[model samples]
Target: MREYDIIAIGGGSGGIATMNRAGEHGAQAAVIEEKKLGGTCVNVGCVPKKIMWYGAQIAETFHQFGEDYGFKTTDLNFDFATLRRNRESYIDRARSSYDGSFKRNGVDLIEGHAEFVDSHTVSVNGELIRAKHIVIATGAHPSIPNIPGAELGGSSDDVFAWEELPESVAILGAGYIAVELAGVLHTFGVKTDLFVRRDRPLRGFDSYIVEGLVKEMERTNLPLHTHKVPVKLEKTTDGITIHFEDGTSHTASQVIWATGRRPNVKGLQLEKAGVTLNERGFIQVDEYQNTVVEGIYALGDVTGEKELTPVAIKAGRTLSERLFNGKTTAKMDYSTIPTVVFSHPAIGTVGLTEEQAIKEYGQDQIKVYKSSFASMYSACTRNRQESRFKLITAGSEEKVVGLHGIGYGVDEMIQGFAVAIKMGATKADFDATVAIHPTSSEEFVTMR
Candidate 1:
C-alpha cells in the first residue's frame, strides 16, 4: 500500500489548491483524478465560457455598434471552430501551468478514479493508498430532467464542445448557465430562445437588475419565455420538440438542458468511508471544511457552499493553512464574495439583496438607492443599451449592504465596491469618493 500525508480524491480547483498548500509546508500530498487538471471551470465552465462571451461581445460590436461609431465594415466573418480551437488551446496552456505548480510544490498527480476503501484509505485502479487525511472535491455535474427524450438533449458541457454553431437551439431553464449560453449563441448568429419555468431568469438575483436584462432582451429580439415548464421532449425528423405544461410546444435543431447541477458523489461509495451527506446529497461540512468523519474533509461543489471556483479555492487554501501551517484558526470567510453573470449586458452582484436586507433588518430600516441611464458608450450608438445600479443599505449609519448593476462596463466594476462593502463601508463613504464622470461605474458613488 502507498502512503501519503494527504490525498485529495479529485483534481479540481479546490483539491489542487489544498494539496499545493499542504505540499508547500513539507507534507506529502497526492491528487487522484481521472481527467484533466483544470476541472469544470477551466475545461468547460468559466474559462471557455468567458472566451465565448468575449467573442459574442465582439460580434455585438461588429453587428450593432460599429456602423454607428462611423465605421462601415461588412466583411467581418466568424467561425465557431476557430474560436473553439483557440479556446481549447488556451485551456491546455492553463492546465500545463497547474501541472507546473504541482511539480514545483512536490505534489504527486495520481491519475485514476478514486473510491473510498475505508476512512483513510482509497482504492484506485486496483491500487490501495492510505493517507493521514483525505480531501474530496469531486465537484458537480449538470443535471438533466427525466423527461422523455431528455437524453437527446445536451448540457452546457456539450455547448462548449461544439465545433460548429447549431442552426437554432431551445435552452431550457433560467439560471446563469441558460442565460449565458442563450446570449452567446444568439449573438453568434444562432437562433436561440430561452425558457424559464419561473417569472424570469436569475430569480435569486435582485429584480431591479433582472428588469434591465429583460428589457435588453426585448430590444435585441431574443425570445425569453416565462412560466415555461418543460413537460417532455420528442424527436422529430428535423429536430427535437419540447412540450411545456402550458399546452405549447417548440422545436429546435438542438435542445440544451440548464436546469441545475447536482454534486458528483455518485460512484465514490462514500458510505464505505463513513462520510455523511446532507439531505440534498451534498457532503456536510463545518466552517472549517471538516466532514463528520475524522481525518476526512470536503469542499467546493461537493460541499455545496458557494459553488464558485474562487470560493472552493479559498476554502481549500484556508483548510490547508489550518492543518499544515501554524495558522490553526484559519477558515474561509464566506460572506461578501463578488460574482458576475455573463448575460447580454452582463450583471455583477455582491452581498445581500434588497429583500434579504429587508428580511434581516426589517422593512422600516432598509433603504435603497438606484440609478438608471444609458452608458456613454451606448449613448453614442444608434442602439443604446441602458444601465441600472442599485445599493441596498440598512440601519441608521446606512452601511452599504448590497450592490448590483447591469450594463456594458459593469462586469469589471463590482470588485472594488465589494471590497468596500466587505470592510463595512457606509453610504456616506461612497458619497465621499470622487465620481469618475461619464462612466457607468460612477453611478454607484453618485447615487443618492
Candidate 2:
C-alpha cells in the first residue's frame, strides 16, 4: 500500500492548490487525477473560455472597432480551427507548469479514479493508497434535465471540444455560462440565440447590470428570448430542434446546454466513508470545509461554495494552512468576493446586490449611488455603448458594502476595488482618492 500524510482525490484547481500548499508545509502529499492535471478550469472551462472570449473580441475589432481606429484590411475572416489549436497549445503549457510545480513540491501524481476504501484509505487503479487525511476535490460536471431527447444537446465541455464553430447554435440557461457562450459564439460569426426561462438572464445580479446587458444585446442585434424554457430537443436531418413550454420552437445546428453543474461525487462512493450531503446533493461542509467525517473534508464545487476557480483555489490553500501550517484560525473568508462575466461589454461585481443589501440592512438604512453614460471607448464610433456603475452603502457611516459596474475595463478595475471594500473602505474613502480621468473606472469614485 502506498502511504502519504495527505491525499487529494482530484487534480483540479482546488486539489492541486491544496496539495501544493500541504507539500510546501512539509506534508507528504499526493494528488490522484484520472485525466489531465489542470482539471476543468484550465483544460476545458475558464482557460479555453477566456481564450474564446479574446478571439471574439478580436473578431469585433476587425468587424466593428478597427475602422474607427484607422486600421483597414482587404480581407476579413476568422478560422475557428486556428483558435482551437492555439487554445489547446496554451492549455498544454499550463498543464506542463503544473507538472513542474508538483515535481518541485515533491507531491506524488497518481493517475486513476480514487474510490474510498475507508476513512483513511482509497483504492486507485486497483492499488490501495492510504493517507491520514483525504480531501474530496472531484469538482463538478454539467447538469442536464431528464426530459426526453435531452441527450441531443451538448454541454460546455463539448463546446471546447469542437474543431470548428457550428453555423448556428441555440443556448439555454439564464446564468453566466449561457451569456458568455452566446456572446462569444455570436461574435465569432455564428448565428446564436440565447433563451432564458424568466424575464431576463443573470437574475442573481443587480437589475441595473442586467438592463445594460439586455441593452447591449439589443444594440448589437443579438437574439435574446425570455420566458422560453426548453422542454425537449429533437434531432432533424439538418440540425436540432428545441421545443419550449410556451409552444415555441427553435432550430439550430447545435444546441448547447449551459443550464448548470452538479458535484462530481457519483463514482466516489461517499456513502462508504459516512459523508453526508446537503439537500442540493452537494457535500455539506462548514466554514472550515470539513465534511461530516472528521479526517475527510470537501471543498470547491463539490461543496457548492461560490463555485468559482479562484474561490476553490483559496479554499484549498486555506485548508492546508489550517491543517499543516499550524494556523488553526485559517479559513476561507467568503465575504466580499469579486466576480466578472465576460459578456459583450463585460461585468464586474463585488459584495451584495442592491436587493440583497436592502433585504439585509433595510431600504431606509441603505443608500445607493449610480452613474450611467456612454464610455469613452465608444466615442470614436457611431455605435456608442453606455456603461453603468453602482455603489451601495449601508448605515449612517455609509460603508461601501457593494460595488458593481458593467463596462469596458471594468474587469481589471474591479480587483483593486474589491480589495478596498474587503478592507472596509467607505464611500467617503473612495471619494477621497483621486479619480483616474477619462476612464470608465473613474465613474465609480466620482459617482453622484
Candidate 3:
C-alpha cells in the first residue's frame, strides 16, 4: 500500500494539470492512467482533429484558391498516408513533452485503471493506493445509438486512427463534431454528406452564425440533410447504407456516428465511494470541484460543465491552488467561456446566444448589432465567402453579453474579445476601440 497527499484517477488534461500543480506546491501527488498520458484531446479529439482541419485548409487552398491567386500547379497529389504519419509524429512529441513537466513538478505517474476501494483509497492493478485528496477526471466517450447494425458506424476516435480516407462518408448528428468532420472530409475531396435530426446543425448556436455556415455549405456544394433520423445502418457490397426514419436511404463508403458522448463512469465504481452522479451519469461536483464525499473531487468532462480542454485545465489548476496553496476562495468561473469550431471557414463564439440573451434578460433589455460582408480572403477570387459577426448586449448600460462570428479567420479572432467580455466590457468599450483595416475580425468592433 502506498499513500500520497493527492492523486488523480485519470491522466487527462485535468488530472495532469491538477497533479502537477499539487506537486509544485510541495504536496506529494501522482496520476493514474490506463493508456496515453494526454487523454482524448491529444489522443483522438482536439489535437489530431485540429491537424486534420489544417490539412483540409491546405487542400482548400490548393483546389479552391491557388489558381485564383495566380499560383497554378501541375498534377498536384495529396497523400493521406503522409498526413497521417506526420500527425502521429506530432502527437508523439506532444505526449513526450509532458514527461518533462511531470518530472519538474515531481508528480508520479501510475499506469493502470483505477477503481475506488473507499472514499479515500483506490485500487490499481491489485495495489491499494491511498490519498488525502482524490480526483476523478476520467472524461467521456463517444456515444453510439442503440439501433440495428449501429456497429457499422465508427466514432470520432476511429476517425482519428484512420490510415486512409474513405471514398464517401455519411455523418450522423447535429453537433459541432459532425459539422467539422463533414466540412474537413468534403474539403479533402471526399464525397461527404451531413445528416441532422433537426432543421439545422448546431441548433444551440446563434442563428445568424449558423445561417452563415449553411450558406457556406451551399456555396461549397456539400450536402446537408435535415430532419434525418437514422433508423438503422446496413453494410453494402461497396459501402454502408443508412436508413433514415423518413424511408430515405443514403450510401457511403463509411458511416460516422458523431451523435454525442457519455461520461466514462461505468468502471469507476463511484457508488462504493459515495460519489453521486447527475441524471446524465456525470459526476455531481460543486463549484469548487468537490464531490459529495469529503476530500474527493472531480473536474473536466466528468463533471459535465464546459467540457472544453482549457476549462478542465483551468479548473484543475484552480483546485490545486485552493487545496495546496491556501487560496481557499479559488474556484472555476463557468461563465463567458470562449470556443471555436474548425468547420469550413471556422466558427467562434463566447457568452450567450441571441435567443438565450433575449430569453434571460427579456427581449426589450437585449440589443443585437450585426455585420455581414464578403470575407477579404475569398473576396479576391470569384468564390467570395460571406462573413457574419454579431454582438449581443443587455441592460441599459449595454454590457456585452455575447459575441459570435462565422467566416474565414474567425477561429483566431475570438480569444481577445473573450478576455474583454470576461471583464464585463460594454458596447461603449468596443465602440471606442479603433478597427484594424482589411480584416474579418475588425467587423466585430465596427458592427452596428
Candidate 4:
C-alpha cells in the first residue's frame, strides 16, 4: 500500500500540472500514468502536429514563394523520415523537461493504469494507493464512426504515428483536426481531399473567418467536398474507397476520420467511487472540478470543456492553488479563452463569434469591423494570399466581444488581442493603439 496527500490518475497535461502544482504547495503528490509523460498533446497531438505544420510551411516556402523571394533551387527533396526523426527528438527533449520539473517539484511518477477502488483509493498494478485528494485528468481518444469498414480508416493519432506520408488521402470531418491534417498533408505534397457533411468546414467558427479559409483552400486548389457524409468505406486494391451518402465514391491511399473525440473513462471503475458521468459520458464536475465524490475531481478533455492543452494546464494549476495554496476561491475562468488552428495559413479566434454576439447582445447593439487584403509576403508573389480580420463589439461602450483572423501569421497574432479582449478592451481602445506597419496582425487594430 502506498499513501499520498494528492494523486492524479492520468499523466496528461492537466494531471501533470495538478500534481506538479500540488507538490509545489508542499503536498505529497504522485502521478499515475500508463504511457508517456506528456500524454496526448506532447505524444500524439499538438506538439507533433505543429512540427508537421512547420514542415508543411517549409515545403510551401520552397515550392510556392521561394522564387518570388529571389531564391531558387535546381533540385529539392523532402525526406519524411528526417522530419519524423527530428520531431521525435524535439518531443523527447520536451518529455525530459517534464521529468526535471517533476523531480524539482517532488512529484512522484507512477507508471501504471489506475483503476478506482473507492472515492479515495485507486489500484495500480495490483497495488493500492490512497490519497486525500484525487484528480482524474484522463484525457480523450479520437472517435471512430460505427459505419461498416470504419476500421479501414485511421484517426489523427494514426496520422501522427505515420513513418511516411502516403500518396493521397481522403479526410472526413469538418472539425479543426480534419482541416489541419488536410492542410498539412496537402502542403507536404500529398494529394489531400477534405470532405465535410456540412456546407463548409469549421461550422462553429465565425462565418467570415471560415469564408477566408474556404477561399484560401480554393486558391491553393485543395479539394474541399461539401455536404459529404460517408456511409461506408470499401477496401480496394490500390487503397480505401469512401462511399458518401450522395452516391459519390472516392478512393485514396489513406483515409482519416477526424470526426471527434470521446473521454477516456473506460477502465477507471468510477462507479466504485460513486462518481457520475454527464449525458455525453464525460465525468461531471463543478466549476472547482469536484466530482460527485468529495475527494475526487476531474478536468481537461475528460470534462469536455474547451479541450485545449493550455486550458487543461491552467485549470489544473488553478485547482491546486485553490486546494493547497490558501487561495480558497480560485477556479478556472473559462471565458474568452484564445485558440488557434494550424490550418494552411492558420486561423486564430477568441471571445464570441459575430453570430453569438448578435444573439446575446441584439443585432442592433453589435458592431463589426473587418479588413481583408493580401498579405505582404504573398503580395510580392505572383500568387497572392488573402488575410482577413474582424473585431466584433457590443453595446454603447463598444466593448470588444470577439476577435478573429485567418491568414499568414494569424496563429501568433491572436494571443495579444486575446489578452486585451479578456480584459474588456473596447473598440476605441484598439483604434487608440498605433499599428505596426507592413504586418498582417496590424489589420486587427487598423480595421475600420
TM-score per candidate, chains pooled: 0.99, 0.98, 0.98, 0.99
Clashes of 2: 0
lDDT of 3 by residue, 1-448 (tens): 8999999999999999999999999999999999898999999999999999999999888787787889987798999999999999999999999899999999899999999999999999999999999999999999999999999999998888788898999999999999999999999889999999989999889999999999999989999999999999999897899999999999999899999988899899899999998887799988899999999999999999988999999999999999999999999999889999999989999999999998899999999998889876788887888888999999999999999999889899999999999999999999899999977777878877
> In model 1, which regions exceed 4 Å deviation?
none
Residue 277 of model 2 has an lDDT of 89
Candidate 3 runs further than 4 Å off: none
Model 2 stretches with alpha carbons more than 4 Å out: none
Per-residue alpha-carbon lDDT of candidate 2 for residues 70-152, written as tens digits (9 for 90 to 100): 88989986789989999999999999998899888889999999999788899998999999999999999999988879999
Candidate 1, residue 409: Cα displacement in angstroms equals: 1.4
Model 3 — TM-score against the truth?
A: 0.98
TM-score of 4: 0.99
- Candidate 4 lDDT, 1-448, residue by residue in tens: 8999999989999999999999998999999999998999999999999999999999988788899899988899889999999999999999999899999999999999999998889999999999999999999999999999999999998898899999999999999999999999999889999999988899879999999999989989999999999999999997899999999999999999999999999889989999999998899999999998898999999998889999999999999999999998899999889989999889999999999999999999999998889988889898888888888999999999999989889999888998898889998899899999977877877777
How many clashing pairs in candidate 3?
0
Give the alpha-carbon lDDT of every model: 0.92, 0.91, 0.92, 0.92
* Model with the higher lDDT, candidate 1 or 3: 3
The positional error of residue 163 in candidate 2, measured at the CA in angstroms, is 0.2
